[PDB]
Write a protein that binds this ligand. Structure first.
Ligand SMILES: Nc1ncnc2c1ncn2[C@@H]1O[C@H](COP(=O)(O)OP(=O)(O)OP(O)(O)=S)[C@@H](O)[C@H]1O
Ligand SMILES: Nc1ncnc2c1ncn2[C@@H]1O[C@H](COP(=O)(O)OP(=O)(O)OP(O)(O)=S)[C@@H](O)[C@H]1O
Ligand SMILES: Nc1ncnc2c1ncn2[C@@H]1O[C@H](COP(=O)(O)OP(=O)(O)OP(O)(O)=S)[C@@H](O)[C@H]1O
Ligand SMILES: Nc1ncnc2c1ncn2[C@@H]1O[C@H](COP(=O)(O)OP(=O)(O)OP(O)(O)=S)[C@@H](O)[C@H]1O
Ligand SMILES: Nc1ncnc2c1ncn2[C@@H]1O[C@H](COP(=O)(O)OP(=O)(O)OP(O)(O)=S)[C@@H](O)[C@H]1O
Ligand SMILES: Nc1ncnc2c1ncn2[C@@H]1O[C@H](COP(=O)(O)OP(=O)(O)OP(O)(O)=S)[C@@H](O)[C@H]1O
Ligand SMILES: [Cl-]
Ligand SMILES: [Cl-]
Ligand SMILES: [Cl-]
Ligand SMILES: [Cl-]
Ligand SMILES: [Cl-]
Ligand SMILES: [Cl-]
Ligand SMILES: [Mg+2]
Ligand SMILES: [Mg+2]
Ligand SMILES: [Mg+2]
Ligand SMILES: [Mg+2]
Ligand SMILES: [Mg+2]
Ligand SMILES: [Mg+2]
Lengths: 218, 220, 222, 214, 220, 218
């Protein structure tokens, strides 16, 4: 009766997570700029829809839906079609040039409307942050969503996220790195923690290509 | 004559060897570590093994993880915590926030210790001043009850401060550090008994793994 | 058309190769660097080449260097910016402070007038709570995108291998990020350029050495 | 200058005869480095070997735990308290610096103590509050060990960056992690007015207390 | 050399005019930053002194802490008689030593016009406030047509260029003097980090301070 | 008329300083705890008296005069006698159970009362720290005193003094270090800066012995 996992179908990931993302829980995906956070959270939804007909909700706070859709064309994915078919909903919480309760109600309404099984959320007292994140995680779990939530960090081998508390209130933590060494960049993915279940340890190299994320062996 | 500090066995593989007999009885042991280092696991094993091996009841006090998730996650190791709660040998005390007062918490814990006649307690998990003073009080109250207690704390660097506020180790009788060090793209888990007041213990870091059977520590 | 984002050529030696075709069109690219790394040079060369090679007018927004000093220094690279200004192909908008809070909303409208007046396709913008910086930069980026400009915006940083920019937020609201470095190794300096991020498209990774010459930036073959 | 023997194995050699009489010695270390043990041993040996009574001042650890913990070294502190040779001054919680000082003075006069151990914002305030404490202990004639906390092995002497500059004598206890192993060392950094061995010397804590190897 | 966009005046400081490809950009300010005792005041004085001796270009020296008497006294280390130059009206030392920047600027202007000065040396809360006033001072000297050396302090050999993290960004030109300690020995170097509108040699170049002032040794 | 120097007679130092301390100015002597700052400043005055019959004034802010005397006995220096003879004056500015201009009054008075040619002063707004040190330096200069003033620092290879401003208002700067080499300590002396005059550069090893500071220029 240990926790079950949901397949990401992201090449390499379901192997190192031994089955995918823990179902009904949130996974924090943290990374410096341009590490593949949005791509991971899109590929999660896109594969849910295409492979399993599991509808998805994508929550954006800054990037517009138009740009998310445009950028996904880089990978040969037609997100506008999936939205039009009612398989995907891009929920725009991005500011026009905060009430967590209101946001949570909108996410819940969208999940019910689209019968969504997968959610991606992308992306000043740390006591405040800790409390609010806790509440968001709790509410998504109550709803039954399996969720990817991305977060920013500014150092490759420093704090997991910005406020030093995000990981401690997350059930699952994944870290994307983009390490510069000898003038070259190397992308890696690490599953740091999955509460109540197993996973491979340490950094695994990956690339972003025309196909999305590809994760490779040691 | 040399009168030794009594210890109670954790029965966590390898730990009773490193600690020269287990955790000092009637005192609190701080168990600190970065995220996913096995803090909750250690604190659950402590109670579980007490009940299963020694019929010593336990109280688990949780501040963030819900009891249902604690129970769910324990299934990963083949442990049936709901059954122990049903038999009244384990009490999970839910101090979660529903999505300040310490005295109330203490009486609640005291009540539970009395009701379930628990010998073992696990507690999971602004200024330097208040945290030092508040933690000092909690240690003192638990000691007056006679509980042997594991209390977990967070830290954010493997080789930095022992806990978050830089004072927690100084008001703790006993300090254990769980590390998860990243080197050359690989992770290595270690456990270190840093301090046990009034008694002996092995020194330095000892590697461990987490598997289907929980924590397994290797000397070395 | 339902195609991945297209690019406009900078014609800066080597850069269009590293970026696989140039800067993403209709978007802003952050160009960050310590002092004297070539930020202003990169911003100007982007506009200059647009005008000379493609007859695409440019607007240069300066916040500290006077237009006269911008024009004077650009002669170092064989470029006659006064001539381009006279012909109405280049407009320098002087937002530099009085030698004798800042309304970014108002400035944006004036930038838009200039873009409209000069029919500009390329824009360069040459350089305290971080939440305020994030929101203001976000709004500027959005407004330029709405206008349809392809924009270079420079920012400052103080360490070669530290934060991308001053407030730790600038790169996260930028679609594109380029880092110019000037690394001191064994008493010598080595200039490098890195495209760190281009949302929605491919680019070469890591650092590429370059020099500044009498013809501007020259990024070496790799 | 006249020194008083600690009789802590190896320490009197390192200090070239012991701790200068009538003066204060800071003993700083990270957690579990042996600060309390050093403090206790200093008083214990003074009583047992030289019939020099002692006062132990504790701010957090209770008297009963101090006594209990000392029992494992085979040291019967309760017996010494009963004989009036040791007084443990409980300043534990459940300012005034001056109120405490007057109580320290009173116990010293009462028990005829020659040895004192004191077991553990603005630098400005701390520096002259500590200077005040040190100055007065001197006037009384006590020879004092004052422990302080630090959070890094190689880094500031003590928490507030001034403690060492008002102390006559400074001792640092370290617990350094090399690879995955811990090694304890003691260093006399400073002894005003006299010579001493320099640098770090390894020690162990065993059933008989601190054992240092020069 | 001839094919460069910015006219320069020669410091006549041995080796500097080579590294700067002709000297300091005329009518602009050059920041000279360095830790303590790196040669900042010496460079500033040598600039004015050589201007007077070589080209009969009068100079103004603005001091904010060192007294004129001590600046004169210390310059005798190099066999320079600054009192004689002050007597002859070729040098003016403006004593601003113990903010009203406007009043200061007017004093500097009056002295420049009074002494017909061509060369100026200035020696030496929020970053934003420092940035804007520095920007203003630079702009005013530029309007006047002065060629200015302005020294600033820094506290690390390989850290920030100056104290407030903004000074280099509002300067047209930036020079860093270092005094690097390595293996118990000090070695002095000079670097021209930036000269807007022109080329210059890059990196660090060795120099010494002797009885003849600064001697820089360029290479390449 | 380059600035002249007065001999310290401290073994090796007059070589490193090419003649001694600049006359009529202050020299800052900075170092971590127990580096020999008080000892250097005492040896400065003791040698003034013994070698040149130049009286000295010692200004103490922490240590009592009695402790200063006692601590110098291990070097064979009889400061009690020097005080009894009126050749040395120890000015006590310790804590009462900050008017700086009061201090100069007291120092000035002692200087002319004792015919003194040498002075030692031993020993968080960097704003005001800079200004007040600047003022003290200037006042001592107008008196004509040649002064050693000690100051604290907390790292062997970091800031010269505590507030990062002290060296910039000092005419002269000397740094004493006490460095770990393996588990042993090595003491070194550095003359970092003497305005308007020459000096040897870098660190020179020294020891503290029964005859005080002993430096080797090698
Ligand atoms: N077709 C492609 N081939 C290769 N790499 C690509 C392609 N399309 C996009 N990328 C890469 O994907 C990166 C963007 O990844 P994202 O998922 O947008 O990163 P991010 O971590 O979300 O960054 P933010 O949100 O801007 S902080 C770009 O910087 C490119 O390096
Ligand atoms: N069956 C299993 N086999 C191997 N590893 C497991 C298994 N079940 C759980 N784990 C590991 O146990 C870790 C969780 O340990 P916890 O005790 O929950 O950590 P924690 O230190 O309490 O972390 P927090 O509370 O989230 S900061 C997971 O990240 C897994 O790596
Ligand atoms: N003809 C040239 N040949 C070689 N290098 C040159 C030439 N002209 C200018 N430079 C260099 O260009 C640098 C200035 O480039 P900029 O683009 O002004 O840098 P920046 O990053 O904008 O610096 P700021 O704004 O002052 S922080 C100078 O410091 C010189 O090193
Ligand atoms: N009988 C014993 N045998 C071996 N080691 C012992 C024994 N008794 C105590 N210790 C050791 O001594 C340490 C405690 O020393 P203390 O002097 O209490 O440390 P401390 O530096 O005062 O730490 P605090 O006050 O908790 S920060 C324990 O952590 C053990 O490692
Ligand atoms: N006879 C001696 N032989 C060798 N070393 C000695 C002798 N007497 C004193 N010392 C050393 O001199 C040091 C004291 O030097 P001080 O000049 O008092 O140091 P300090 O830098 O003033 O330190 P403060 O003021 O306490 S921060 C002692 O720590 C001893 O190491
Ligand atoms: N005749 C000389 N021979 C050799 N070196 C000398 C001579 N005269 C002075 N110096 C050196 O020049 C240094 C003084 O240089 P300055 O120009 O005064 O430094 P600075 O950078 O202005 O320092 P400040 O203002 O005190 S932070 C001294 O520390 C000596 O090392
Ligand atoms: Cl890639
Ligand atoms: Cl493991
Ligand atoms: Cl170059
Ligand atoms: Cl030990
Ligand atoms: Cl030199
Ligand atoms: Cl020595
Ligand atoms: Mg993104
Ligand atoms: Mg846990
Ligand atoms: Mg620029
Ligand atoms: Mg203790
Ligand atoms: Mg100077
Ligand atoms: Mg001293």
């Amino acid at each position: 009766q240990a926790i079950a996992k949901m397949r990401t179908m992201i090449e390499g990931f379901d192997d190192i997570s031994h089955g995918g993302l823990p179902i009904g829980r949130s996974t924090l995906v943290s990374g410096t700029t341009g590490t593949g956070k949005t791509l991971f959270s899109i590929q999660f939804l896109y594969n849910g829809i295409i492979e399993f007909d599991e509808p998805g909700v994508f929550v954006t706070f800054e990037e517009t839906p138009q740009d998310i859709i445009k950028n996904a064309r880089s990978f040969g994915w037609d997100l506008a079609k999936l939205v039009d078919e009612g398989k995907l909903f891009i929920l725009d919480a991005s500011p026009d040039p905060f009430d967590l309760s209101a946001l949570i109600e909108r996410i819940n309404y969208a999940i019910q409307k689209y019968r969504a099984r997968r959610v991606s959320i992308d992306s000043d007292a740390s006591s405040v942050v800790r409390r609010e994140l806790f509440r968001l995680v709790a509410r998504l779990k109550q709803i039954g969503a399996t969720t990817v939530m991305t977060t920013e960090r500014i150092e490759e081998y420093g704090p997991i996220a910005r406020y030093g508390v995000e990981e401690f209130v997350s059930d699952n933590v994944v870290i994307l790195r983009n390490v510069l060494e000898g003038e070259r960049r190397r992308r890696t993915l690490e599953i740091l923690k999955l509460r109540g279940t197993s996973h491979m340890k340490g950094e695994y190299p990956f690339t972003i290509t025309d196909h999305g994320i590809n994760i490779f062996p040691l």
